[PDB]
């Protein structure tokens, strides 16, 4: 039939998740942001559209930090992005508290991954309208 | 309701004309056994605040993690974290003060006595105390445990009232504090010869001195003391 794109956890007959795909639409439509992995670290850059001369320059900062060694930048629904970072911050604190060592970028990745993947499992939640570029330096690179 | 196990002794401090000084020996006692010797009981938070802790060491370690998190957190979404919106001594104190009283009120205290020392953004000197009961107070000089009995009487001779602070220099001040550290080594049975000292000067910033030692101790007369009353040899 049809309407396989009205609920968030439904598989269409060809095995897709339209709500997730639509979420991507929100992303592609957002400001551009990038990440470049250099020889001993990473660099994050982002486009900040001046919708008017009224926006204070150097103010509405987009890039966010998780802990002290992780950087995040995303495109799409900004509010959704902060919500994701806020979760990464607790996710990281929880890790450091028990293991003492600041969270490895790889481990942090999957922490964010499992969280986001979880918002595509239930029709009582909406997927994240953001794609995030993040990274940092840890015990091995 | 707990009971302290590995403990830290006195933490003394006072304020001079341009800032404050704070010191604490590097001992971690376990009853009467002077078990640990590389214990730094002076926690610097930023570079305008030093927090000296005495009492249960495990709880101190825990207060330490809270302090580091307070710093990590203040940075979040804070473009002025190292400037206009950096952590002030007064914020750090008020935070601990809160945590301390909340814990005593839950009948599960953090077995410690704490002194937050530093310089406020406007130059002002900050020195305040808080203990496992959540009790707080300020004075030109502050000490915990044994230092409250022996160190205060000494340091107060240097800065007795408020009007004495501007007249006190870092030399005079650091001096009194080192002498006090010596006296405490003479009479406190739970003290060590090695200690750490710190100065937070509104101009020079934070000077953190480690591995100091108690020097110039009078012991010679110990030879002329024999017996306990009538013995002569």
Swiss-Prot record, chain A:
<comment type="similarity">
    <text>Belongs to the peptidase T1A family.</text>
</comment>
<comment type="subunit">
    <text>The 26S proteasome consists of a 20S proteasome core and two 19S regulatory subunits. The 20S proteasome core is composed of 28 subunits that are arranged in four stacked rings, resulting in a barrel-shaped structure. The two end rings are each formed by seven alpha subunits, and the two central rings are each formed by seven beta subunits. The catalytic chamber with the active sites is on the inside of the barrel.</text>
</comment>
<protein>
    <recommendedName>
        <fullName>Probable proteasome subunit alpha type-7</fullName>
    </recommendedName>
</protein>
<comment type="function">
    <text>The proteasome degrades poly-ubiquitinated proteins in the cytoplasm and in the nucleus. It is essential for the regulated turnover of proteins and for the removal of misfolded proteins. The proteasome is a multicatalytic proteinase complex that is characterized by its ability to cleave peptides with Arg, Phe, Tyr, Leu, and Glu adjacent to the leaving group at neutral or slightly basic pH. It has an ATP-dependent proteolytic activity.</text>
</comment>
From Swiss-Prot, chain B:
<comment type="similarity">
    <text>Belongs to the peptidase T1B family.</text>
</comment>
<protein>
    <recommendedName>
        <fullName>Proteasome subunit beta type-7</fullName>
    </recommendedName>
</protein>
<dbReference type="GO" id="GO:0005634">
    <property type="term" value="C:nucleus"/>
</dbReference>
<comment type="function">
    <text>Non-catalytic component of the proteasome which degrades poly-ubiquitinated proteins in the cytoplasm and in the nucleus. It is essential for the regulated turnover of proteins and for the removal of misfolded proteins. The proteasome is a multicatalytic proteinase complex that is characterized by its ability to cleave peptides with Arg, Phe, Tyr, Leu, and Glu adjacent to the leaving group at neutral or slightly basic pH. It has an ATP-dependent proteolytic activity. PRE3 and PRE4 are necessary for the peptidyl-glutamyl-peptide-hydrolyzing activity.</text>
</comment>
<keyword id="KW-0963">Cytoplasm</keyword>
<dbReference type="InterPro" id="IPR023333">
    <property type="entry name" value="Proteasome_suB-type"/>
</dbReference>
<comment type="subunit">
    <text>The 26S proteasome consists of a 20S proteasome core and two 19S regulatory subunits. The 20S proteasome core is composed of 28 subunits that are arranged in four stacked rings, resulting in a barrel-shaped structure. The two end rings are each formed by seven alpha subunits, and the two central rings are each formed by seven beta subunits. The catalytic chamber with the active sites is on the inside of the barrel. Interacts with CIC1.</text>
</comment>
<dbReference type="GO" id="GO:0010499">
    <property type="term" value="P:proteasomal ubiquitin-independent protein catabolic process"/>
</dbReference>
<dbReference type="GO" id="GO:0005829">
    <property type="term" value="C:cytosol"/>
</dbReference>
<keyword id="KW-0539">Nucleus</keyword>
<dbReference type="InterPro" id="IPR029055">
    <property type="entry name" value="Ntn_hydrolases_N"/>
</dbReference>
<dbReference type="GO" id="GO:0043248">
    <property type="term" value="P:proteasome assembly"/>
</dbReference>
<dbReference type="InterPro" id="IPR001353">
    <property type="entry name" value="Proteasome_sua/b"/>
</dbReference>
<dbReference type="Pfam" id="PF00227">
    <property type="entry name" value="Proteasome"/>
</dbReference>
<keyword id="KW-0647">Proteasome</keyword>
<dbReference type="GO" id="GO:0019774">
    <property type="term" value="C:proteasome core complex, beta-subunit complex"/>
</dbReference>
<dbReference type="GO" id="GO:0034515">
    <property type="term" value="C:proteasome storage granule"/>
</dbReference>
<dbReference type="GO" id="GO:0043161">
    <property type="term" value="P:proteasome-mediated ubiquitin-dependent protein catabolic process"/>
</dbReference>
<dbReference type="GO" id="GO:0000502">
    <property type="term" value="C:proteasome complex"/>
</dbReference>
<dbReference type="InterPro" id="IPR016050">
    <property type="entry name" value="Proteasome_bsu_CS"/>
</dbReference>
<dbReference type="InterPro" id="IPR016295">
    <property type="entry name" value="Proteasome_beta4"/>
</dbReference>
